[PDB]
């Protein structure tokens, strides 16, 4: 009598895949002041459960919510397979995984000495991945000189921006990059990254599966969780 899930589903191994996917957005002053910041999250569930279960999801200050039609500390018969359990958005007490610290210095009207420092700010137990930093260059840029201790950088002069790429970097660390911009006689610094944790601080408390028509209880379900945070707009002024 449920239009989103058939009857007579049986899995040998009743498994549960729970992906928490957040996008952290941040607009910072060069001086570290959070000008605007928020997280947009969804909770995707892959569900391999037998029959017609009644499940309860439960997990900090959420602002919006947008559940699936099945939802009613929320109970629901989840469909079979992948579906998005809920969307959400938070704005307070967000973990900002990186601190971008620009520093520019003029040299006459010919040179531009630029130095940019990124600070990771999370358990050093954990690695950030796919780290990319864009430093835009002015339009009247003749050439660019740049060196950097970690990772690689290149002056994508078509895009009129420096792109610095870093494979990994653990938390509570710091790396920098220095550049000389010769020019011909101020958008922000962007970052992208992936972190193995929900920046909002969200963590999943319990997921309970109740099947009273079939021969399994909650002790029987195998339950798995994954947290992944990525950047959206992640810019620093200067």
């Amino acid at each position: 009598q449920i239009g989103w899930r058939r009857e007579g589903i049986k899995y040998r191994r009743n498994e549960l895949f729970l992906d928490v996917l957040e996008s952290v957005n941040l607009l910072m002053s060069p001086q570290g002041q959070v000008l605007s910041a928020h997280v947009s999250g969804r909770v995707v569930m892959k569900s391999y459960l037998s029959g017609m279960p009644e499940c309860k999801f439960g997990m900090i200050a959420i602002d919006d919510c947008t559940f699936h039609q099945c939802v009613r500390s929320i109970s629901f018969i989840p469909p079979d397979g992948e579906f998005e359990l809920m969307r959400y958005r938070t704005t307070k007490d967000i973990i900002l995984p990186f601190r971008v610290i620009p520093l520019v210095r003029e040299v006459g009207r010919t040179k531009l000495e630029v130095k940019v420092v990124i600070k990771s700010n999370f358990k050093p137990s954990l690695l950030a991945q796919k780290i990319e930093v864009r430093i835009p260059t002015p339009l009247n840029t003749s050439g660019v000189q740049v060196i950097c201790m970690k990772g690689k950088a290149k002056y994508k002069a078509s895009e009129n921006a420096i792109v610095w790429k870093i494979k990994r970097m653990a938390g509570m660390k710091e790396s920098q990059i220095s550049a000389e911009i010769e020019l011909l006689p101020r958008p922000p610094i962007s970052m992208n990254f992936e972190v193995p944790f929900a920046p909002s601080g969200l963590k999943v408390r319990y997921l309970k599966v109740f099947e009273p028509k079939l021969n399994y209880s909650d002790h029987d379900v195998i339950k798995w969780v994954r947290y992944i945070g990525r950047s959206g707009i992640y810019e620093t002024r200067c």
Binding site: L18, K223, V225
Partner: peptide, 7 residues
């Protein structure tokens, strides 16, 4: 890649 257990 990595799913961790929930408990």
């Amino acid at each position: 890649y990595c799913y961790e257990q929930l408990n």
